[PDB]
Amino acid sequence: QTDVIVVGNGVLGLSVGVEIARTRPDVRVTLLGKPGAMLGAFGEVTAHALASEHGRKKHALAVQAQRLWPEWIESLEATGTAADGRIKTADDTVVLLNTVGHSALDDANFAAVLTALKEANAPHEEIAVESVDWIDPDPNSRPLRALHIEGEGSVDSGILLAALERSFLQAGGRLHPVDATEIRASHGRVEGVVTDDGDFLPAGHVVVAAGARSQRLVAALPGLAHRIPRIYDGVGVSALVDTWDGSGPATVLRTSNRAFACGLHLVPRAGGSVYIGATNAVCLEPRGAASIEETVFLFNCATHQLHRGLNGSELRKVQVGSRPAPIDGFPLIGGTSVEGLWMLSGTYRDGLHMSPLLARHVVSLMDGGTGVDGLREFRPERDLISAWSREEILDDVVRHTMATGYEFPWRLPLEWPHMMETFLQGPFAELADRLSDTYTPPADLMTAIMFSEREQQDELIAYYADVHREWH
Amino acid sequence: IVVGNGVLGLSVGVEIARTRPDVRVTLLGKPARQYGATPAAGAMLGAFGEVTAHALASEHGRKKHALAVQAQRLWPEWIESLEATGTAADGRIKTADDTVVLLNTVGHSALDDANFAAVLTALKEANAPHEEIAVESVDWIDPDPNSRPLRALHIEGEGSVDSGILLAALERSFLQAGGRLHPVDATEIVVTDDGDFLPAGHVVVAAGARSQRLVAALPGLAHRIPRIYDGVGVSALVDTWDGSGPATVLRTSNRAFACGLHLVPRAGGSVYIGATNAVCLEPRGAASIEETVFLFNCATHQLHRGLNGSELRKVQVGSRPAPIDGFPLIGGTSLWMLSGTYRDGLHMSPLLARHVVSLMDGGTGVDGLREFRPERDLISAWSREEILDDVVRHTMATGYEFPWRLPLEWPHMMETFLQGPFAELADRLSDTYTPPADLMTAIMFSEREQQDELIAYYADVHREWH
Amino acid sequence: QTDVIVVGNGVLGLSVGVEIARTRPDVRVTLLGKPARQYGATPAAGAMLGAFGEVTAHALASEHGRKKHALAVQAQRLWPEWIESLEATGTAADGRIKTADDTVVLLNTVGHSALDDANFAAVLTALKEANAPHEEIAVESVDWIDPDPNSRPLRALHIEGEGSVDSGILLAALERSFLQAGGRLHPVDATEIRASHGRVEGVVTDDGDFLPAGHVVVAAGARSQRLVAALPGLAHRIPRIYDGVGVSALVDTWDGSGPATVLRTSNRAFACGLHLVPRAGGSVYIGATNAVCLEPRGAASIEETVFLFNCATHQLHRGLNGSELRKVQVGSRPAPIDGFPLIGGTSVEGLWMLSGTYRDGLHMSPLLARHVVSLMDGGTGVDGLREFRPERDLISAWSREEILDDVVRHTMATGYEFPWRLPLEWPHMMETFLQGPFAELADRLSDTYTPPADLMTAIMFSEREQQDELIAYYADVHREWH
Amino acid sequence: QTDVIVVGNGVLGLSVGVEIARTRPDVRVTLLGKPARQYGATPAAGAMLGAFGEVTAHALASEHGRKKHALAVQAQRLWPEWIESLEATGTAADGRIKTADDTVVLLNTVGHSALDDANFAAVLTALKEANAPHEEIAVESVDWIDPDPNSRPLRALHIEGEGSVDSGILLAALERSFLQAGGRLHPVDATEIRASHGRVEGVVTDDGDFLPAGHVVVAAGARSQRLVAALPGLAHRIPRIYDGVGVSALVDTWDGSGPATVLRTSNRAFACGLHLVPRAGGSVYIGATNAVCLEPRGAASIEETVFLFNCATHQLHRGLNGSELRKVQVGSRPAPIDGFPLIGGTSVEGLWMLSGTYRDGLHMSPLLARHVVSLMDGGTGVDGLREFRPERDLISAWSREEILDDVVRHTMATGYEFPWRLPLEWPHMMETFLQGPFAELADRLSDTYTPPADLMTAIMFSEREQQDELIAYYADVHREWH
């Protein structure tokens, strides 16, 4: 066929579905799948990310994606009316710097954000904390510096999904509400997709955007098991709160990224609601429910660091979702060794933000183009990337471990932190050396592996050895 | 007609249907059970565990405690009679036989130390089987050492039920006895909220925290039936990290403003943790952030650190019917009422059901319930001075239970500066009536308009009864 | 006589003694006071040459506060030549008076936003208005400090030419300079000032002796007003001075290091503050608590030692935790009841006062000494110091409303500075319940006078008999001046 | 006469001096040591007559621990007549040695369950086994205490006839009793013990003098082994004694009150503990920190003062917060490297040792003094003190595994005693990551000797050079005895 099947009905699948449907009105595009958010670019900057070449490449793509959002939103709202609600919930972001965290993360990351803004010539301003709208922190948890980032905003993800579905149907797209079980290929070319109702759908192009299940789906094809990097579940907890007085901030309020890619932010919503997020934990098997620990940490941070009024506010919903966490720390975007087989996944914290750029990239590739410059390193069929030295990762994992203390925030005898830093180094060095002679997992995954069962560690040692064998 | 489909309404519905097979009994209320206390309950069959020094210092408190001890004796046969109408696959109502009461220092000495001694004394006086045990012998618990118990009390035959399985068993038993479930609400004494009129010779109001507002519309009854407010309670269902649970109820004594910490075992790798309490002058159907954090923080530190890594399945919110004079509304009027049971209507349900059915049959029911007749002047079970001591102690207890860390001069400074404003409030509200601490704190922090409305209410009650 | 007796051997007494002795070589100047220096503020001081570092929003919101600040800036200009003139009378082995040239002010979140944020902005504004050399610097560029990350500063301010002196070396240099100028040290205390026919006759000492004098300069720190108040009518004409009891410590650092600059916060709850003053020889000074007491106290409380040490180890350097405690020091800041110093002449011919300087008499000492010596010589001394004449009705530098807002903020600041951890509703509840009792106290004390916050908190928690005695005092002052 | 020199003027030196002088009309007895009592344990002590209060599960799990406990119980019986005999040489104005008859042991949650819960049960068991008079009492019945509710005890144990002495009044009474019995106080320090032909000749003092003697008794606290170790072969034959640096304080209470009994916890992390010992005249003693140091230290650290004050104000009486700090005291508990005292004779004729008593030499003093004096007179002294002879191979009272479990528990206890507030996963993570480094250190130090936990933590955090010197020491001891 010249038929296109999109596997996955999140922001990535629907965004690629909309772009394909709008760009090839002559072809049938079918999308599979059943029934905050920050547009994070500069707010996502860390010293550690920008210290690596792969990190600077990923950041450049986030900055490119940000430029597409205003026209993208206009093109999606154009297919609806006033009563559909607004996709955009804020235009600007304030980054707050407080002392409820590690200096080695929060101080370094604040300086890195300021530098990245200046280098990109982005509009921004360091502002007086007193000039920050709405916030009412605990004085012992208050910010002493604040950074206004202009044109870095937030969307209502529910209104975005509704606008994407409406836009998909308007462009002639077909929704088939079943899951893909299997991609069929032979003679190095896609034939189509078997669905979980036993049916077969033919296609000339299959775009896999099935979140954390994307690699498991492609890895079943010959040789691909050790050629497509594994994706794990980055379980994230957020909450919808009805504010005591129905108020909200005019901007996103956030810290820089914190221990193990968690962070604190408040995204405005319409109708007296605020979104608060967000925890992150890489889990070696999926989990569908928030832990007690995750809910307490999120609520405690927001009530102390953002607004004490949230303490008396009504909890409407605890939300849980899986960030696709790629084992080498970078997304899987583009073509494979199988003609017509494409992947858009492993986007972790910022697949939603990158969605309009990733959609256009894959559509360009499908049309014989080269899409967006600088995505080549993030091709889905690859040896695991080694974006950092083992030494860099070992420094990072110990700093992030210590940051879980300072972010609590703990109160300990003053000799205890130095004692724990000293005694953490050995076990993480030993683990890294045992896992592989060539591959080192990023800190977020290394902590999950450190505290997993021996059987799960041994399975990863085997995985890493099978990848080495395949690519060397 | 029984108005209300909580434990009290269904329990009285079952007893009426089983006892008068010749009469049509219809029970009103919807599956949503808005603000429903019963589905938010663990629930503990709390008798001795509910004892406080403050309660047992009043005659009315000792009367309420005696009724709880009597109710406990009915539970085994009551459960047998409810499970008899079902099969194995309906699940078990009883979730535990025994209770361990823990004493730790994450609270006020003036509540927790006094209440532990009062529980021990009440057990000995009632000749109840119990034992002070080594904390090391308490199974399953894994507290933070800085939050750990140093004393523990095993109470034999004081257990817990699954409130959801209890409600299902009561409904099934009600239908088996020929009862009719009509899933609408009463608007007026019965006119229902679909505009219909249902005729009846008897109306039993067991509508939880809405019960007094429903009866108060009838001539003169606005100042003759004591007000009932919403004691908003937050609890949670947690799937434990390893699917384990304790063999017993684990609890503290009742704490600041009738909150408390407990874990009730459930089947299938779940535990119930509770429970916050806040008297609200208007109903609230959602947990606050503060309530969720306090509940989770207490359970993870004082009971089991493993709960920290456990999955949150459900945050539950219900309204304890909070009577303005601190005692239930049970019996006949100048029409019957079963309400204002606050923390222990579920536990007392089989006794209260049999009491009201006896009254309806021309009997005198259970001897000591006369003071708790629903049509009454507000009870004054304590002196103003006793309540002012209590409200300041409970206010300070919200600090010690957090637990806070403060400069050592601050607690005495706050005790001194709390006394005046509470004395001023009590004197302003009425020359004769004093609200119990739980309600006094809610009034202290309410709008001036809400305070003035209560001053008028108290004055209208005085005028009616004096 | 034309004899001069200086009563008191702190920085103010010795500084005025040196200036008198140097300026009137023809007269006998005798300085009273003992080596023990009981309740002595000066030996307990670091000490900071605090001008811009002492700026608060509250001080600079009052006319009297802006006047006192201008005098501190003027005093700073005298220090280099003053130190040169004092070291000149000694040799290399006497050691150096100056211990630092510059000050870093740190801003952290271990305190009330309503004090620390307001005061940091006020310091920056005062520096800009005075065209003083200064720079907001990256916290990472602050040398030596090693704070707890949860207690770390996020802003820092380098103040150039605002430094520190060793108060012990200063006192030794002043005594030596006093003797070099022909002064006589008599190590006894004054018990009584003798006056008749509106003129000083001299001083009875606590060994029973009588010393004659044409001039008596009272610089007896917190005892100064109690000494003069015995003279006819002066009990209600010289504002009361109380004890601002201050705790500091000398610490031998783990590695013998110290910072190159003063390290400090802005002034905090009830005029306490956190600072580290460099010393020679592997020692640092840490200070300093403040508590107004209605009676003198010569020993640190447990609370004061814990708070000082806890703040320094978390906010400045965790290495201080393992450092050796050499000395806990206690002195009395002379705390004037109306919040301003007592400097100049009286209705008694030849009777002068130099006191009530609270936190900054050591810094102002060379200016105050020259002012009083000018007055004694028939001059007008320094222009803005006439308002701080010792014989006066109590100053009312703030409205009752301003003081009531201040006392509640400072009370709440004692929580945030601890720092406490409380349920989030508790602070608002305590703010609400503090307002009434402080308003009631202020209204009860007097219809016209309001004590500043530092003294109002001491009175709030004093005995009923002490409150009633102050009500009588305020009524007697009103009667005398109205 | 046949001269005896006692080296050291603590409780052990003076107690042996008194017994010799009273018992031996044939000997001239001279006692060395200065009034300053540098590093002196005795003057820093409260002191508790600790027998049952000193019981821990860990001590009573070893044979050597049960032997030491039996001796403490025996020592208690001697105190009433000993005190009578010392006060007899003075008058009313000298003050009373005994300050309390009874002890209350409190159990709170400001500590590790693995120490405080185990130790409370061990104390109860030891009391019952000895048939000692005692009673578990309601906490509400404990007089005087006013703890923070979050730091309060939930169990309390009254121990009858286990009391306290004023260590200062004891030292004064011992000196006076020594002089009355014809003893000579020579206020200089020994620099060197002179011996030849396997016999003591006497002592070179730090004023350059030589004092001849037939007997030298070394009771120089933590300096005792370093003084004897210079003699041929004795460096590896007398177990090392380190400084168990202890911080205590004298506090004048806010109202001049005090408790009628000793108030204490069981022994806590690394042999620290919390106690209040009554004193006369509106004073209380609070103690006491412990830290084994490889070199002597004569000053409290900031950390030690904060921890001691914080524990006492929260766990015993909040009124201490507002009380006046009169004195911070520092002394060295003689900490033997093998965990047991050094009491009796040596391979050198006339050379005796009384040291390494750590926490309870003052309590054991009358028994230890009589033991050594009996030995000097050709007697056999007290049964069961032979195992603690000073010239010995290091004792191994516990398995390496027992000590490794103990050191990790004690390390974790430093967190719970603070008390810290941490994420709930952190303690298990720290327990896991502490095991490896302590196992590695223990294996590296020696194939045969394991230092007890108190010393192992000090070695773990010492310089590499200090660790290597101890590896050599242990190897030289092995070579000498095997």
Ligand SMILES: Cc1cc2nc3c(=O)[nH]c(=O)nc-3n(C[C@H](O)[C@H](O)[C@H](O)COP(=O)(O)OP(=O)(O)OC[C@H]3O[C@@H](n4cnc5c(N)ncnc54)[C@H](O)[C@@H]3O)c2cc1C
């Ligand atoms: C903890 C602390 C920290 C400080 N830090 C600083 C700082 O950083 N910078 C700064 O500028 N200043 C500082 N100060 C000091 C402050 O400036 C004081 O206002 C100043 O030292 C007051 O000096 P004085 O000479 O008036 O009083 P004192 O220094 O108290 O001297 C008065 C002397 O007179 C003696 N005396 C009392 N009665 C009699 C009598 N009857 N007869 C004779 N003699 C008598 C007293 O014993 C005493 O020695 C600090 C003070 C304290 C307590």
Ligand SMILES: Cc1cc2nc3c(=O)[nH]c(=O)nc-3n(C[C@H](O)[C@H](O)[C@H](O)COP(=O)(O)OP(=O)(O)OC[C@H]3O[C@@H](n4cnc5c(N)ncnc54)[C@H](O)[C@@H]3O)c2cc1C
């Ligand atoms: C903080 C603290 C609290 C304590 N609490 C208690 C308690 O409650 N109960 C209890 O029983 N015990 C207590 N102790 C003391 C403990 O029992 C000690 O083991 C005991 O005091 C040791 O006495 P000593 O005479 O061996 O040593 P020390 O008391 O140290 O006496 C040795 C003396 O010899 C001197 N000396 C050193 N070198 C020389 C030399 N070369 N020549 C001459 N003299 C020299 C020293 O200066 C010193 O004065 C406590 C100790 C401390 C530090």
Ligand SMILES: NCCCC(=O)N[C@@H]1[C@H](O)[C@@H](OC(N)=O)[C@@H](CO)O[C@H]1/N=C1\N[C@@H]2[C@H](O)CNC(=O)[C@H]2N1
């Ligand atoms: N704020 C970051 C969230 C992720 C995180 O901190 N993970 C931790 C770490 O891997 C490690 O702890 C620290 N503090 O470094 C580890 C210690 O065992 O615990 C992880 N967190 C948990 N992982 C545990 C399991 O999911 C089940 N039980 C729990 O309690 C869960 N908690």
